[PDB]
Amino acid sequence: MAHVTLQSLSNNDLCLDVYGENGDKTVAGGSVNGWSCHGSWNQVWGLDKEERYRSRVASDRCLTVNADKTLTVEQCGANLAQKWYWEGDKLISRYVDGNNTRYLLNIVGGRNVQVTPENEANQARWKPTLQ
Amino acid sequence: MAHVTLQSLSNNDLCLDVYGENGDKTVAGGSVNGWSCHGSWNQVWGLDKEERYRSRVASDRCLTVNADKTLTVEQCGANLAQKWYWEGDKLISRYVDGNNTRYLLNIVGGRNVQVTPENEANQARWKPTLQ
Amino acid sequence: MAHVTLQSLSNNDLCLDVYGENGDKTVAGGSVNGWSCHGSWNQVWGLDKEERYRSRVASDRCLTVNADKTLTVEQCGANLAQKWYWEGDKLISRYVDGNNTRYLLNIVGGRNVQVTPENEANQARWKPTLQ
Amino acid sequence: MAHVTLQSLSNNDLCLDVYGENGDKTVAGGSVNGWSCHGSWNQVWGLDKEERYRSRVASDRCLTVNADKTLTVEQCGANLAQKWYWEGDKLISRYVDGNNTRYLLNIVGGRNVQVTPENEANQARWKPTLQ
Amino acid sequence: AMAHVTLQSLSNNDLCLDVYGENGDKTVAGGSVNGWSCHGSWNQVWGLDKEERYRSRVASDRCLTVNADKTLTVEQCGANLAQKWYWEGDKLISRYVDGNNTRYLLNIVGGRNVQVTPENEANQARWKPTLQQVKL
Amino acid sequence: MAHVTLQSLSNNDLCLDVYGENGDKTVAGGSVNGWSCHGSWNQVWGLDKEERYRSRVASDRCLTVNADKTLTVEQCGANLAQKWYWEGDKLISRYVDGNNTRYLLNIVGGRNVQVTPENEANQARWKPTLQ
Amino acid sequence: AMAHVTLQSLSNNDLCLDVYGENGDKTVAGGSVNGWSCHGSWNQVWGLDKEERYRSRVASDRCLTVNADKTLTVEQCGANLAQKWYWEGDKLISRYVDGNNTRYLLNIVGGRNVQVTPENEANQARWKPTLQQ
Numbered sequence A, B, C, D, F: 001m002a003h004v005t006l007q008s009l010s011n012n013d014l015c016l017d018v019y020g021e022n023g024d025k026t027v028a029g030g031s032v033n034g035w036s037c038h039g040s041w042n043q044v045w046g047l048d049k050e051e052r053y054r055s056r057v058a059s060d061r062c063l064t065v066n067a068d069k070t071l072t073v074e075q076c077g078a079n080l081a082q083k084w085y086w087e088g089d090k091l092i093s094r095y096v097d098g099n100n101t102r103y104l105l106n107i108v109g110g111r112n113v114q115v116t117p118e119n120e121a122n123q124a125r126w127k128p129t130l131q
Numbered sequence E: 001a002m003a004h005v006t007l008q009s010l011s012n013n014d015l016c017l018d019v020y021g022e023n024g025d026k027t028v029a030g031g032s033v034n035g036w037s038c039h040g041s042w043n044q045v046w047g048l049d050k051e052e053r054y055r056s057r058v059a060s061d062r063c064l065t066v067n068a069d070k071t072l073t074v075e076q077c078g079a080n081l082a083q084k085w086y087w088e089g090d091k092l093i094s095r096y097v098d099g100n101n102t103r104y105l106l107n108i109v110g111g112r113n114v115q116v117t118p119e120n121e122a123n124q125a126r127w128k129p130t131l132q133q134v135k136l
Numbered sequence G: 001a002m003a004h005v006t007l008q009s010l011s012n013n014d015l016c017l018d019v020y021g022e023n024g025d026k027t028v029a030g031g032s033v034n035g036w037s038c039h040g041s042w043n044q045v046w047g048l049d050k051e052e053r054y055r056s057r058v059a060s061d062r063c064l065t066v067n068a069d070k071t072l073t074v075e076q077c078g079a080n081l082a083q084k085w086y087w088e089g090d091k092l093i094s095r096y097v098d099g100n101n102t103r104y105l106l107n108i109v110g111g112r113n114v115q116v117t118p119e120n121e122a123n124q125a126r127w128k129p130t131l132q133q
C-alpha cells in the first residue's frame, strides 16, 4: 500500500487533513477538512483493498462521509460511505441516497472540505501524492 | 475459484446473505436475501466453472432463481436458474421464461433481494469482493 | 479437442442427447434429440478437425443432419451434413439445399431438437460446456 | 507446402478431382472436375510459391484454366491461367481477358467444375482442408 | 532520473529560460527568471522533479515559481501549486490557480520578458526541453 | 538483394524484358519491353537501396524512364527517372515533369511496355516474383 | 556518429542540396547553399545532429542556416532556431520564426535556386534524406 498526501489541484496549497477533536488527532469521529500541506501523519493516507482511505494518525481510522456530507475519521467498516475511487483527478465516494447523484470530494469554501454533488463540485481536483 | 462477498453498490450497507430456513443456514431451499455486511460464511460465495455461485454455508448449495423471482440455495445442478454472469457491476441470471427479458440481481425494497427484468432493475449494482 | 456437453441457453435445462434406437445408444442411425442434462456418455461431444461433432457413445459416430432436418449419429465421412460451426452462441450446419437458408441447431416445441432455417430459429442458443 | 483437399461448400459432397484420361490420372492434359470426397492422391493439392495448385497425382501437374474455361492438369509454367488466390471461401483465377471480369472456381452443373465470371458464379464456395 | 535540460523557446529564434539572479549573483532565493540567448550554463539548466517542480541547477533548493503578478522567480522548494508544471505538447503549463477560470502558460510577453499568461492569450508559448550535458 | 522477375498480372504471360540493341542485351541504352516469361538474365531484376531496378544482363544497367516515356537500361545514377517504388501491385516511377502526375509501369499494346499517367494506366498490375 | 546523407529533391529529377561556398572554397563561413546535380562529394553530404542541425561535411562547425531573406548558407553551429530542421514525410521544415506566422519549408524556387518558402506556397518542396554509407 502506498502512503500518499491528498493534495488539492483546485487550491494553491491545501491537503486533506485530520483536524481531530480538541488537539487530539487520534480520536474516532475526529473532523477532516483542509490545511496547508506539511505531510505529517494527519495528512498521510493509504487506500486499502476495501477502497477505504486509512489515516496514519492511528489504527482503524478511515475517511468517512457523514449524513450531512461532512468528513470525519471513524473505525473501518463495510459501509459505502467509507469507500472511494478515482476518476482522473476526481475522488469519488460510493455513498448513495435518493438524489441520484455521485458525491465528489470538494472544497466548499475556505478550508472546508466535504462531498458535493458531481454537477456542482467546482473545486474537486485532487492529486494522490506519494510520500 | 475465488471466495467473495457480493456487496451492493446501490445500498450503503447490503450484502447477499443466506437467511436459511428457520434460522438454519445449511438447509436446501433456504432463503437468500440482503443483510448488513459481516463476512460470515453465509455471506461468502464462489463462482464455479459451471457459472454457479456456491455458498460457503455447506457443500452443494448454489444460488438459485425461483419461479416467483425470489432466491434460494439449492443442490447444485445444470439448470440455467443457477447460472450467473457479470456485465460490469450487473449480475445477470441465465434464467429464461416467456418474457424475452434478462433478469438481474436486484434490491426490490428494504433488504429484499430478487431478480428483476433488466429494464426495471434500478438497484442492481454489485461488487464481488475478495474475502 | 475439447469434450463438451451442448446445453441450450434457450431452455432452462436441455442438452443435446443421443437417444439411440430401441434402447441401444451405440447404433449408427441412432436418434439425437433433447434431454435434461446429466453429462453422461450419451451427452458428451467433441468437435474434430473436420468440423464434425463426434459422440462419446461409440467410435465413429458423428452428429448428422438428415433430409427431414432431424438429427442422428452416423459413421463419420466428408458430407456437409456432418459439419458444424459456431457464430457466438449459434451452432450452424454447413448443410446446403435449394431453400436459400442456413440451418441452425434449434429447439421446436419443448422436447424436439432439430435444425431450423435461420430466420425461424427462435431457440437456437447453445453453450459448449467442458467436462 | 501444405497439402489440401479442395472441398465445395456449395454442394454437400464434392471435391476437386483429377479425372485423368482413360483411367490414367497422371497424364498431362488430364481433365479436372468434381467427385465425392475420398482424399486419395488425385484429390490432394498443394499451393506452391508461384500460386499454382499442384496435384499429387504425379510430379509437374498444375491446375490450369483452359480457353473454354474447363480445367485440366498441365505441366507447370508461368501463365496466369495456372495462378490461383483465395478471398474468403472464393478461389479465384489470375486469368485475364477482355471481359472485365474475375473468374471463380465454380460448380456449373452436376459434378462439372469450371471457372465462371464472378457475378454469375453461384456455387463457388470452397474450403481448403488440410490432410 | 531527473534529466538536465535547457528550456528553449520555439517562438523566438534564440531564447532560453534564464535565472537572472540579482546584482550578478545567480544563486539568490527570490531571484528573477526571464529569457536570454542560449548558452547552456547552470543558470539555464533545469530539471523536473517528482513533485513536478522545475529545479534550477544554479544552487540547491531553487524552484521555478509563479509569483502573484505572474512574473517568475526561483524560490526555496515547497508544496505550492505555484511551483508545479506540466507539459502538453510544446506548452509548459503551471498548476497555479485563481479566480479567473484559466490555465497559465509559460509565455514570452515581449523582448526577453517571460511570464505566465492566460492560455487563450499565450501567443509565444512554445518550448522545447533540450537535454543538456552538465559539467560538475 | 532479392532477384526477381517482374511479371504482369494484366496479361496472361508477360515479363519485363531487356530487348537490347541489335541483339546485344548488355548495351547501355538498350530497349526494355515485354516478352513471355523464361527467367533468363535479361528478365531478372533487383531493387537496390537507391530504388533502382538493376538488370542482370550486365553490371551497371538500371531501368530508366526516357522523356518519350519508353524504357531503357542505362548506367546507374541519381536521376529520379531511375527510381521506382511499389504501391500494391503498381510500380510507380519517381520521374517528374511539369504535368504534375505520377507515371506507372504499364502495358500500352501487345508487348510494348512504357510508363503511363496514373489515371490512364489500365494494364499496370505487376508481381515481383522471386527467382 | 551521424549518418551520411545527401538531401535529394523528389520535385526535380536531379537536384541535391549543395554548398556552393565562395570563389570555389566550399569551407567558408557564410558560404552559399543552393542546388546542384547529385554527385555525393562532401559539399553535398550532410548529417543531422542531436540539436536538429544539418552539419555539412565540408569542414568542422558548418550548419545549414536560414537567413533573414530566406536564402541558405552554412555558418558556425549554435542554438538559433534558424539552424534547426525537422521532417514531416518528405517535407524538410525549418524552426525559423518571424512576424509572418508561417512555417518555412526547404523549397526549390527556380532552376538550381533553393531557399525556404512559406508552407502554403512551397510547391517544389519534397526531399529524401539519402543514405550514402
Ligand SMILES: CC(=O)N[C@@H]1[C@@H](O)[C@@H](O)[C@@H](CO)O[C@H]1O
Residues within 6 Å of the ligand: A017, A018, A019, A020, A035, A038, A040, A042
Ligand atoms: C502539524 C499539525 O498537526 N498541525 C495541525 C494541522 O494539520 C491541522 O489539523 C490543524 C487543525 O486545526 O491543527 C494543527 O495543529
Ligand SMILES: CC(=O)N[C@@H]1[C@@H](O)[C@@H](O)[C@@H](CO)O[C@H]1O
Residues within 6 Å of the ligand: B017, B018, B019, B020, B035, B038, B040, B042
Ligand atoms: C452472523 C449471522 O449469521 N447473522 C444472520 C444474518 O446474516 C441474516 O441471515 C439474518 C436473517 O434473519 O440472520 C442472522 O442471524
Ligand SMILES: CC(=O)N[C@@H]1[C@@H](O)[C@@H](O)[C@@H](CO)O[C@H]1O
Residues within 6 Å of the ligand: C017, C018, C019, C020, C035, C038, C040, C042
Ligand atoms: C439417465 C439417462 O442416461 N437417460 C437417457 C437419456 O439421456 C435419453 O437418452 C433417453 C431417451 O429415451 O434415454 C435415457 O435412458
Ligand SMILES: CC(=O)N[C@@H]1[C@@H](O)[C@@H](O)[C@@H](CO)O[C@H]1O
Residues within 6 Å of the ligand: D017, D018, D019, D020, D035, D038, D040, D042
Ligand atoms: C478412388 C478414386 O481415385 N476414384 C476416382 C475418382 O476420384 C474420379 O477421378 C473418377 C473419375 O471418373 O475415377 C475414380 O477412379
Ligand SMILES: CC(=O)N[C@@H]1[C@@H](O)[C@@H](O)[C@@H](CO)O[C@H]1O
Residues within 6 Å of the ligand: E018, E019, E020, E021, E036, E039, E041, E043
Ligand atoms: C554567461 C551568463 O551567465 N550570462 C548571464 C545571462 O545568462 C543572463 O542571466 C543575464 C541577465 O542579465 O546576465 C548574464 O550575465
Ligand SMILES: CC(=O)N[C@@H]1[C@@H](O)[C@@H](O)[C@@H](CO)O[C@H]1O
Residues within 6 Å of the ligand: F017, F018, F019, F020, F035, F038, F040, F042
Ligand atoms: C532467351 C532470350 O534472351 N530471348 C530474348 C527475349 O527475351 C527478348 O528480349 C527478345 C526481343 O527481341 O529477344 C530474344 O532473343
Ligand SMILES: CC(=O)N[C@@H]1[C@@H](O)[C@@H](O)[C@@H](CO)O[C@H]1O
Residues within 6 Å of the ligand: G018, G019, G020, G021, G036, G039, G041, G043
Ligand atoms: C563537383 C563539385 O564540387 N562541383 C561544384 C558543385 O557541387 C557546386 O558547388 C557548384 C556551385 O557553383 O560549384 C562546383 O564547383
